[PDB]
């Protein structure tokens, strides 16, 4: 059973990632078959936190690579492809410092041309990417794709598809296949696979991953309250304005270069500080999610994964705390947001270095779901919270892979005979 490889860096917003994958020779282009073999996490910031220093970059993804040199088998080593893909936090950089942007890829091509994998290239993804590749991993993983039935009695309609949510860092993409119209070709996405045309809906948006968010909630914290309504009471950090304001998700908000910021378990003010995140004043379509931005009604079954799913599992697993339903996830916010700070340390014995901001996370959660997307009891309840499927980690790197590998067709071996005509 000969075996071929392929190797993702998924070089995150605060962190990178490496994923081996594995598929045998033979059958590479079924759905599903690829699966993965090994992983491994990069020490230390994603590849954006060294435009100061962009050698360290490059040298930061070494100890991984030497992994990638044990998992995958010696003389397999020289076809594996490699790539490095990037994301929102590159592509803050990049209105930041296109410079500094181009010498931290530069820096990372360099360390990957140095190992014998078929290095493919370092890019920075689009937020079309990288919703459409997480939508790709999932329903690929899943089989969602097989046409199901047989000859004289397929199954009508055809096997829905899974949503997907994915909240990185620096941006969070919804993507979903939908039979609504289409009112903006920036978030219209349309997929050849396997024969069958999958009409999608797309979109990403930059600041509003888990971190720039946090980060916004901070500065707006600082201005309208002196306060931090989102933080447990007991909790509290100096907080250096200049670092506040140098995002460019928040530097919309700048305005004693220190200030004592201290938390005030207050459910009600958080919540309030999380929804002027979305602005739902307008809309140039015939309807939105926020910001302005086309969506259709959301429909089917989703896969929220990557901090929804680890937010999640902290209110259930860590508070103990039902979230079924939206109205229980906003009762589990409360309560987790109500905690005080030696409350909520008391129920996690071991070091969480970030216990303060899962009352924001999970706030923000809550509310990107209610009001930005407009889930409701009845669509709600189709999302499943999971980082995994089929033993795979859920991301955007498999169906990244999948596509420049070119492992899945766009048509069947011999149209199928032509039996889904
Ligand atoms: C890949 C890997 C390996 C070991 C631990 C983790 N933990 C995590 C990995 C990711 S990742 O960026 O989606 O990869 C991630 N997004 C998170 C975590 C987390 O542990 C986590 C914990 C609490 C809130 C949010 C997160 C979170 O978003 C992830
Ligand atoms: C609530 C929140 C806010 C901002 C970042 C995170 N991320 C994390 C928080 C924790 S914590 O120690 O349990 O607090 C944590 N252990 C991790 C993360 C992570 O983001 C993370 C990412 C990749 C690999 C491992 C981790 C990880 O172990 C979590």
Known sequence: PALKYGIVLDAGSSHTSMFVYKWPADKENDTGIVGQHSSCDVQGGGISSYANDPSKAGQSLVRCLEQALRDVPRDRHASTPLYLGATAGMRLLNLTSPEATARVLEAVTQTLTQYPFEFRGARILSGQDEGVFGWVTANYLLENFIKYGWVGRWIRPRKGTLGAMDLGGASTQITFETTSPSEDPGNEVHLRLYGQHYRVYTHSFLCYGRDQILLRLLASALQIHRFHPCWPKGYSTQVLLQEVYQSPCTMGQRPSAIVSLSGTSNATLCRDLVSRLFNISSCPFSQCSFNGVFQPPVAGNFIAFSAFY?????????????????????EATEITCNQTWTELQARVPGQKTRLADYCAVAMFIHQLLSRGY???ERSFREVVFSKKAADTAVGWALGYMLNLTNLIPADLPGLRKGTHF
């Not at 680890?310 to 906003?330: A, H, I, N």
């Open 310 to 330: 680890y937010t999640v599992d902290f209110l259930t697993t860590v508070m103990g705390l039902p979230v079924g339903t939206l109205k229980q996830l906003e």
């Open 374 to 376: 407009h889930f409701d």
